Write an enzyme that holds these catalytic residues in place. Structure first.
Site, PDB file in Angstrom:
ATOM      1  N   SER A 203    -113.806  45.224  11.268  1.00 19.16           N
ATOM      2  CA  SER A 203    -114.152  44.926  12.692  1.00 19.16           C
ATOM      3  C   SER A 203    -113.099  45.539  13.641  1.00 19.16           C
ATOM      4  O   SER A 203    -112.821  46.769  13.606  1.00 19.16           O
ATOM      5  CB  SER A 203    -114.277  43.440  12.812  1.00 19.16           C
ATOM      6  N   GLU A 328    -125.115  43.128  10.616  1.00 20.59           N
ATOM      7  CA  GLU A 328    -123.959  43.174  11.495  1.00 20.59           C
ATOM      8  C   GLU A 328    -124.130  42.306  12.749  1.00 20.59           C
ATOM      9  O   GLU A 328    -123.164  41.806  13.309  1.00 20.59           O
ATOM     10  CB  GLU A 328    -123.671  44.626  11.891  1.00 20.59           C
ATOM     11  N   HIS A 441    -121.356  39.978   9.403  1.00 22.89           N
ATOM     12  CA  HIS A 441    -120.121  40.735   9.320  1.00 22.89           C
ATOM     13  C   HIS A 441    -118.910  39.819   9.071  1.00 22.89           C
ATOM     14  O   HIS A 441    -118.793  38.670   9.491  1.00 22.89           O
ATOM     15  CB  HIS A 441    -119.897  41.657  10.531  1.00 22.89           C
TER      16      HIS A 441
END
Ligand code: I1X
Ligand code: I1X
Ligand code: NAG
Ligand code: NAG
Lengths: 536, 533
Positions: A203, A328, A441
């Site tokens: 990330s 995601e 995610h």
């Protein structure tokens, strides 16, 4: 000394360290936790570039994680494992620039490839001390030397009055760079090879890794890079100098501080918590997947926008692993899109989809928004609540992660980098988020760090084998620039991503499967059409 | 003489001719005048009903073809020549044709009325592919087809003028439909069951009649093959019709009355010589003189009319062929030819899009290219070629058809939709064109039943099935056979399920959504785009 474990005593540039002997499922590892790598960035040093830690005297105890950097703490679902596993697990402090090291026990004979983890958390949160980042498994099973560092986040890390001396911006990234320099100078004392350093991060950590690739002074402090669900390009990882100046000025007003020097001086008198309490209040629109204080295109750390730099940079000498998780976008929906909750199925209406799109694509004019809605609508079932739910997730995921990744992989390959790409498709049997969120995610990390090898965490046998595969891919890549096992050709191979064939692999319980095109049609929408559309 | 061949219509008596169909004789009445010759000062004017005649009028032969441009791109090539006039050209062309079974039907028989296509600039009811003998002999149908004025003679318009009010080619059609109402009973036809069916410009004409109140009392059902009254080529505004007409007049040497007077002194071929020169852009699938939104025949734009109309007690059959766009590429788009594979570059693809979507801004054209590009194989010649075809066919036919289908269904009409996917074994266009526009017609008219045309046995069987669908639809408003109790059934197209069927050699297959994602792009997104520009 005298009675202590002789195998836990080590000197670095700043002095003597005492580490601790940790048990990992397969045997002991050496951990050196809470090593200071900078002067505490406090008082008159708030918002300033970090300075190297002055040498200390005597033997510094390095047996416990240190303070985590002062930050916003998530309270959406109080007591819920899915959220709290990301929350700070040590005291919050501005005195937080410490790093951690795990090595085999005893320390390796010959110099060992080094992995450096950079955590995510939207540049407003995160800590190197969280359980999911436990380097003990990689060190024991794969023999790796693993380093993770704390870096300043939020305002303390990224508030910028561009051009000023007192708040130049990007100091959170400079914290990261200082730690990389620390590794170059000191990691050999742990048996680590300073000429083989791989960065990896997820990330905002992944975006950070990308910043380092793009910033010349960082380039001599590592050799390979892994980017998990994040990129320096894309709509959230950076801001212009103008926007950063606006956000910093607004924040100052919100906390009573109306010349850059005088303003920053007044902010330096504010309690850390007052800054955190107003941080989220300066965003230009109602949004998700946008963060107030992030890296700024300053003309210094970043000589230009990441888009321009990936489009023209030379990357002949780079080896990069990149990838995404299957879902995601699902995570963020419950943090801002009406209709979404972790406690129901989140079946939304067409109206809620349109409203969600404006929040998930906050820069879009009405036309761009409609383009998005038309692209993602299923015209055979334009009102099916389940499809709209999943379409909302895909919108937020594609726009913020998958298509920025697809773009980065494509530009890197075209400019001489060796790129390897994946999509991570396995949902942990231990996930506490609802099933509709798929593979959110952040939930590959525990597999790459090998947590399923810990019997007490109740993963499946299949998941433990799977975790081992992944650790083997990542450390093979660390070692050679190639995730494939040399002494094993029988297993299916992981081909490089190229612009011509656009190959990538699925990472799940089943053996490696090769696929082509990372959301090719859809990412053409986001990466080619939409920019031209917003130019009207 | 044969009393089966002698008929009295309101204008006087006719002698038709007995024709051989594979399975038996039919009665043909060819060259029946339904209007005063639109010649001299009647040029560009609304048709007038034919005056009564003395004795027996010979109707054993096709009459002249309306004066029109004749295609010369591929001289002597069947694939083009089969569409060229097969009779002498004349402004004196307002005649119609009738086929009936032999002997004349004992009971009143549903009537099918064919309206040909030809881009409103060409066409004739005498073409061999429009031969009515097969539907008459096999399905016992009464088949009518008329000539109507095309090009400048049918559609040159100075809106608001008395002497060139526009749409007279559509008035020609309407007069023929009126003629059928008044006369078809004498042939054993049932005037209370009239089905229009037409292809391309003919289909768009059929559509106009659906949208024009005075036409509605003249038919009960409609079939639209590969054409629509809505969409980018079927109509022009009053302003643009006026512009093209005055440009044509300037090009040939000529206030409205004087303008049209001088035009009327011009030999027919002088007008045709220049008619392709008044188009505002370099384009394909665009035509100079077409129906005009006059606020008379068309009270408003087709889109406005389909959006607000009430269509209960209407049944419609609509469809497309598998490759609507392939035909036209060889007529304008560089890189395309019938004599090779037509494997184009990407640059040629971008160029083709500006030609195929002449009204597109740079941004819009970019949207089209990005949508049709295969980003896994962005530069593959075969893909770019097939995508070029798709852009043209989708924009001009498939998505207009989808829009019409959806609008009619939403507003109470009974709609059946198809895609035609069988490629004739006899086809002479290259393989890459696939199933081109126009090449379902021979099957519907049942030509494969003619042994000498060297169609295959399966194609014969297939032709028979199509003839059944079409005539069942004419009989009942429903293509499904009321006696056959074997699946699968042809379901009605609806806005919810969007069901349509594939017409090929395999049994009916039901599919959902007529290119729904792509047509949303054309029908919903582009207009917001070209608007904002
Ligand atoms: C200060 C803050 C706090 C929460 C967020 C945020 O986006 N939370 C949702 C995702 C987890 C974002 C900010 N921020 O804008 O810095
Ligand atoms: C005067 C003319 C001539 C050719 C066209 C035209 O577009 N022809 C291609 C179509 C092939 C037909 C089968 C169009 C015109 N026109 O503008 O009328
Ligand atoms: C789920 O719950 C949230 C709040 O608890 C609510 O806003 C939302 O409408 C609910 N959605 C559904 C589909 O029940
Ligand atoms: C694992 O499962 C056992 C079942 O007996 C349970 O007692 C234990 O608390 C579980 N631990 C975790 C971390 O889920």
């Amino acid at each position: 000394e005298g009675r202590e474990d002789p195998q836990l005593l080590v000197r670095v540039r700043g002095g003597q360290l005492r580490g601790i002997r940790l048990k990992a499922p397969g045997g002991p590892v050496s951990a050196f936790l809470g090593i200071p790598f900078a002067e505490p960035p406090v008082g008159s040093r708030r918002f300033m570039p970090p300075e190297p830690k002055r040498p200390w005297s005597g033997v510094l105890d390095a047996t416990t994680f240190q303070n985590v950097c002062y930050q916003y703490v998530d309270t959406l679902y109080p007591g819920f494992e899915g959220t709290e596993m990301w929350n700070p697990n040590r005291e919050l402090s501005e005195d937080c620039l410490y790093l951690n090291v795990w090595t085999p026990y005893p320390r390796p004979a010959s110099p060992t490839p080094v992995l450096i983890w950079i955590y995510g958390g939207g540049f407003y949160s995160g800590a190197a001390s969280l359980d999911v980042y436990d380097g003990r498994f990689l060190a024991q099973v794969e023999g790796a030397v693993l380093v993770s560092m704390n870096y300043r986040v939020g305002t303390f890390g990224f508030l910028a009055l561009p051009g000023s001396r007192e708040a130049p911006g990007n100091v959170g990234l400079l914290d990261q760079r200082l730690a990389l320099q620390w590794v170059q100078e000191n990691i050999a004392a742990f048996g680590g090879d300073p000429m083989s350093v791989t960065l990896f991060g997820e990330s905002a950590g992944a975006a950070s890794v990308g910043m380092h690739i793009l910033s010349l002074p960082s380039r001599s402090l590592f050799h390979r890079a892994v980017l998990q669900s994040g990129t320096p390009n894309g709509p959230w990882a950076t801001v212009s100098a103008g926007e950063a100046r606006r956000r910093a000025t607004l924040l100052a007003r919100l906390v009573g501080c109306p010349n850059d020097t005088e303003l920053i001086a007044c902010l330096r008198t504010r309690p850390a918590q007052d800054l955190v309490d107003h941080e989220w209040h300066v965003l230009p629109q109602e949004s998700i997947f946008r963060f107030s204080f992030v890296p700024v295109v300053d003309g210094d750390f970043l000589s230009d926008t990441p888009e321009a730099l990936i489009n023209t940079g030379d990357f002949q000498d780079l080896q990069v692993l990149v990838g995404v998780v299957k879902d995601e976008g699902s995570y963020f929906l419950v943090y801002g899109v009406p209709g979404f909750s972790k406690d129901n199925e989140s079946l939304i209406s067409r109206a809620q989809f349109l409203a969600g799109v404006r929040i998930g694509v906050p820069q879009a004019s009405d036309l761009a928004a409609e383009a998005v809605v038309l692209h993602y609508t299923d015209w055979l079932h334009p009102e099916d609540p389940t499809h709209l739910r999943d379409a909302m997730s895909a919108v937020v995921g594609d726009h913020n992660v998958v298509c920025p990744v697809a773009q980065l992989a494509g530009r890197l390959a075209a400019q001489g980098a060796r790129v390897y790409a994946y999509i991570f498709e396995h949902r942990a049997s231990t996930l506490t988020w609802p099933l509709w969120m798929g593979v959110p995610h952040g939930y590959e990390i525990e597999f790459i760090f090998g947590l399923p090898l810990d019997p007490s965490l109740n993963y499946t046998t299949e998941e433990r084998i799977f975790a081992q595969r992944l650790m083997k891919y990542w450390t093979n890549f660390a070692r050679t620039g190639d995730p494939n096992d040399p002494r094993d050709s029988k297993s299916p191979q992981w081909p490089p991503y190229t612009t011509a064939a656009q190959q990538y692999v699925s990472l799940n319980l089943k053996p490696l499967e090769v696929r082509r095109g990372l959301r090719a049609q859809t990412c053409a929408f986001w990466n080619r059409f939409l920019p031209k559309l917003l130019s009207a």
